[PDB]
Amino acid sequence: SGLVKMSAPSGAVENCIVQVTCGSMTLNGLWLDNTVWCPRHIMCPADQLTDPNYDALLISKTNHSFIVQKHIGAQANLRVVAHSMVGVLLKLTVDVANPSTPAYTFSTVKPGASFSVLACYNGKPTGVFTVNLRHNSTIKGSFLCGSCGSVGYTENGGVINFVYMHQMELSNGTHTGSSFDGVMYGAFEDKQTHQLQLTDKYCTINVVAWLYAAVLNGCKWFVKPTRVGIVTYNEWALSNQFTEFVGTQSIDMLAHRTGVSVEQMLAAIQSLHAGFQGKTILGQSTLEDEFTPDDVNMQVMGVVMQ
Amino acid sequence: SGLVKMSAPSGAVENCIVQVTCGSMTLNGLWLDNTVWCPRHIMCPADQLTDPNYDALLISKTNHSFIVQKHIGAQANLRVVAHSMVGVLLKLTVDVANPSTPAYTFSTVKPGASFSVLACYNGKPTGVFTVNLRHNSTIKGSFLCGSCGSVGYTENGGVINFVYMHQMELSNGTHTGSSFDGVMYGAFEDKQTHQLQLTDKYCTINVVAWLYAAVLNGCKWFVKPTRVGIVTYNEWALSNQFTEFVGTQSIDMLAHRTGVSVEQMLAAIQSLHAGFQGKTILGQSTLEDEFTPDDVNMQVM
Ligand SMILES: [Zn+2]
């Protein structure tokens, strides 16, 4: 038992981190098969990081103005034999295919989804932690200057899912980056201007998952015969900065395991948001909305009598 | 900026995980050089083990009573050519030396210290999280039945420091284990008994580091000119479930950078213990004590 922010083992991602240099600039990159991915402001120097134009900066470059080095494990080497710009990423083709490429895919997480981040500095993996895409499509990470190109991922059934490359800090403890199609989460632009982030909401279905985790771990005082129907819950949510609740198989597995109905949980969320009345749920006195139903199921994984 | 629970990358440790099978069913093991470490309660059944004698449990079995497999990466079966017992650990020798043994050392953490954990099942790495050795030398982690033999570590300069092998769960969300010299943290034992488990306290130097992190992330409302001397604070701390404060360099680095003195933070602790009164610090309403000065230095620099 217990519930902690848990990350996927970073081993398979570590073997793919490289360093990418362009002029005075050096960032982290991701080496998969014959391709190296890194943020495109690699081409921007000390000068124009404010409000540059990348289109001009790109044609200015050649397959040689990029050098790629691997500074961990099996060393490298690596010759850029082609280069392109995909959104806010730069896509490099290299002569050698990464021998340690894991089975993988690219996808884009939706708000409320969690993933693991391998934080990197100077091409060295430095830390692992879990975040989730907030309702305003930012993450609340821990990054410092030099950490761009750091890699967000999940792992499911042998497949590494690469979903995030770190780009920037929007404000205190608030970060964003892009998926590997080079779309920036939240549509922020990669220039150093004031860009405002939208409001952000508690993710209801994650709060519900959390409450089910509590119950399974012996905390159940917030559970009453009181119920709020989904449609009613959802009307209240639109005025109280909560996301709308939509049912899922994963939540229904938890309702079934605990014998506590979803609509009891939504009522609990209404009460608790008004105040924990000086009590605690798994140590917290505020609502935790960053464990997903899948995250909860993986840590309260059990045998089911059928 | 930002402050989160961060773990050391686990790849070098993943390379060392193996599955050990005895008589019967399996635990996780750590494969370093020609050695494999794993909890000793693996020479064990499932019916009775309440008051066992490990003496004979050891001599009763022999060499290939143990099957050791590497399931991830390069798959191997690893012959066991020798075995012995250190404390609550089992120290096997195997004919093949792990070619991916990282530079490593063994140590024992003190209460208040934090380390990374690679949770494992069937010799397979599943999750990584960070924990903190509580005052009563337990940890609050996330472990399920087949997780025993899971490995706690820290990393420095390319050296893996192995500090923890998971042994059992005590209460709920309450777990414990041993260092690699076979000594159990908290001096608990391979037994199904509700052992007393000491009283647990807030780790003061860690709360201080956390308050420093808060200031460095734009949150500083709790800072007053009000000071409290260290000696005066320790007195108060015994009557109030807190650990004694002992200045270190990591802290001074934070005091310096923020220009806020340790005595201010101590004073702030007394104020906030009583309660936060509607106000939050770094999204929390309670005094977080599981980030160490080093953690904070690492994340804020
Ligand atoms: Zn950068």
Instruction: Copy the structure tokens of residue B12.
Output: 């070098």
A130-166: burial string, b at 16+ Cβ within 10 Å, e else: bbbbbbbbbbbbbbeeebbbbbbbbbeeeebbbbbbb
Question: Could you give the CA distance from residue B236 to residue A54 in angstroms, rounded to a whole number?
Answer: 60
Sign of CA dihedral B249, B252, B256, B258: positive
Does B148 participate in catalysis according to the annotation? yes
Instruction: Copy the structure tokens of residue B191.
Output: 């037994």
Determine which one of B148, B166, B175, B203 is catalytic: B148
Give the DSSP letter of residue B102. P
Instruction: Copy the structure tokens of residue B128.
Output: 């990584």
Q: How far B61 CA lies from chain A's nearest CA (Å)?
A: 32
Q: Could you tell me the CA-to-CA distances from B253 to B243, B259, B293, B296 in Å, in that order?
A: 21, 10, 9, 11
Instruction: Copy the structure tokens of residue B134.
Output: 């509580």
Q: What is the CA(A55)–ligand 1 centre distance, in A? A: 18
Q: What is the CA(A27)–ligand 1 centre distance, in A? A: 6
Sign of CA dihedral A65, A66, A71, A76: negative
> Domains (ranges, CATH) in chain B?
1-14+103-200 (2.40.10.10), 15-102 (2.40.10.10), 201-301 (1.10.1840.10)
Strands B67-69 and B80-86 turn out to be unpaired
Report the 3 state secondary structure along A152-176.
Answer: EEEEECCEEEEEEEEEEEEECCEEE
Determine which one of A16, A22, A38, A148 is catalytic: A148
Tokens 């969690």 belong to residue: A114
Q: Where are the beta strands (DSSP E) in B95-236?
A: 104-106, 114-121, 124-132, 151-156, 159-169, 175-178
Q: Residue B117 in contact with residue A2, Cβ under 8 Å?
A: no
Instruction: Copy the structure tokens of residue B197.
Output: 């488990």
Q: Which of B9, B280, B286 sits opposite A125 (nearest CB)?
A: B9
Instruction: State which residue of chain A sits closest to B11, comparing Cα positions.
Output: A11
Question: For residue A202, with 0-12 CB atoms within 10 Å meaning exposed, 13-18 middle and 19 or more buried, which class applies?
Answer: buried
Residues β-bridged to residue A132 = A114
Q: What is the structure's resolution, reported in angstroms to one decimal?
A: 2.3
Q: Which of B3, B118, B175 sits opposite A9 (nearest CB)?
A: B118
Q: What is the CA(B280)–ligand 1 centre distance, in A? A: 32
Does A148 participate in catalysis according to the annotation? yes
Q: Which residues contact residue A197 at a Cβ distance below 8 angstroms, ignoring those fewer than 6 apart?
A: A136, A138, A170, A171, A174, A186, A188
Question: Could you give the CA distance from residue B134 to residue B142 in angstroms, rounded to a whole number?
Answer: 15
Instruction: State which residue of chain A sits closest to B8, comparing Cα positions.
Output: A127
Q: How far B55 CA lies from chain A's nearest CA (Å)?
A: 31
Determine which one of B16, B22, B38, B41 is catalytic: B41
Question: Could you give the CA distance from residue B116 to residue B6 in angstroms, rounded to a whole number?
Answer: 8
Q: Residue B10 in contact with residue A10, Cβ under 8 Å?
A: yes
Question: Could you give the CA distance from residue B149 to residue B164 in angstroms, rounded to a whole number?
Answer: 9
Q: Which residues contact residue A219 at a Cβ distance below 8 angstroms, ignoring those fewer than 6 apart?
A: A281, A282
Q: How far B215 CA lies from chain A's nearest CA (Å)?
A: 11
Instruction: State which residue of chain B sits closest to A143, comparing Cα positions.
Output: B1
Tokens 């192995």 belong to residue: B162
Interface test with A, best of B116, B128, B156 (most A CBs within 10 A): B128
Number of inter-chain CB pairs under 8 A, A vs B: 121
One DSSP character per residue, A66-93 reads: -EEEB-SSS-B---EEEEEEETTEEEEE
Q: What is the CA(A45)–ligand 1 centre distance, in A? A: 10
Chain A residues with beta carbon closer than 8 angstroms to that of B175: 2
Determine which one of A16, A22, A38, A41 is catalytic: A41
Tokens 């280069």 belong to residue: A83
Torsion of the alpha carbons at A73, B29, A158 and A112, rounded to the nearest 10: -90
